[PDB]
């Protein structure tokens, strides 16, 4: 079809199971994009449903702080999901470089992340894979806007109806209800937000172990703490929002809407 004719591939930005992400240029327009190239030669019925679901979810979400799908092009043996190019790299890189954010910078960051997650949930989308590697910066100038990316594991949910949608996500960011193999929905994203906000304030995660079984035990038990010295200067209201996000029971866990109204975000 029309990707081969209009677009030109350049360097790899990353690679997946049967997909690669490459910078491309829509030639006649002189505009650059990020092209997710999925290989479609002998895909299962399941794998086709997942591709159409990612495409559908990505078409659904129009928000300042969500990566925009430009186009979805079906060619023989290759599918192209074409997204606005985000040039400031992953949130992950920025945290490591700066070591941690100030509460002001951390608050502005998680505010934009929560406004993105709120929009997802209002549209019946659960990401399941929130982490600093899936948040991109609009530019390399400090205080640039963050953009939620990579909806490959995102699911569609019918209102607040939730269930066992299978084991998916990233170990350190997985919610307790996913590890217990219990019904789950929108709250798994707010648990991940809890992990991200903890990382933003002191520059390391609340759950870590070389042994994955032990990491999962710590997560299921909500066995995190706020050690000296890096927590010594942190406000209790910052610790409060983290606590309300890192709540084991998804019923009593703070929502995106509720978190956006937390004094630490709003009176600021």
């Amino acid at each position: 079809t029309r990707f081969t004719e209009e677009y030109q591939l350049f360097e790899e930005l990353g690679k997946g199971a049967f997909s690669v992400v490459r910078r491309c240029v829509k030639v006649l327009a002189g505009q650059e994009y990020a092209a997710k190239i999925i290989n479609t030669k002998k895909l299962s019925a399941r794998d086709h449903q997942k591709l159409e679901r990612e495409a559908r979810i990505c078409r659904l979400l129009k928000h300042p702080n969500i990566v925009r799908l430009h186009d979805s092009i079906s060619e023989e043996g290759h599918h192209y999901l074409i997204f606005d190019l985000v040039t400031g790299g992953e949130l992950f890189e920025d945290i490591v470089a700066r070591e941690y954010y100030s509460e002001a910078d951390a608050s502005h960051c998680i505010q934009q992340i929560l406004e993105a997650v709120l929009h997802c949930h209002q549209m019946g989308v659960v990401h399941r894979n929130l982490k600093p590697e899936n948040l991109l910066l609009a530019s390399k100038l400090k205080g640039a806007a963050v953009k939620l990316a990579d909806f490959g594991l995102a699911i569609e949910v019918e209102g607040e109806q939730q269930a066992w949608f299978g084991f998916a996500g990233t170990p350190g960011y997985l919610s307790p209800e996913v590890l217990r193999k219990d019904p789950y929905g929108k709250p798994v994203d707010l648990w991940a937000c809890g992990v991200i906000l903890y990382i933003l304030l002191v520059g390391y995660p609340p759950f870590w172990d070389e042994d994955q079984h032990r990491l999962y035990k710590q997560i299921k038990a909500g066995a995190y703490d706020f050690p000296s010295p890096e927590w010594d200067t942190v406000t209790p209201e910052a610790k409060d929002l983290i606590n309300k996000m890192l709540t084991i029971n998804p019923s009593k866990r703070i929502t995106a809407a509720e978190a956006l109204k937390h004094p630490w975000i709003s009176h600021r």
């Binding site: 490591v96 600093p132 084991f167 998916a168 996500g169 990233t170 170990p171 390391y204």
Partner: peptide, 14 residues
């Protein structure tokens, strides 16, 4: 001590 490291996604149990 806890460290900030890159982590790959899962699609099933490992």
């Amino acid at each position: 001590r806890n460290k900030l490291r890159r982590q790959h996604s899962y699609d099933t149990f490992v």
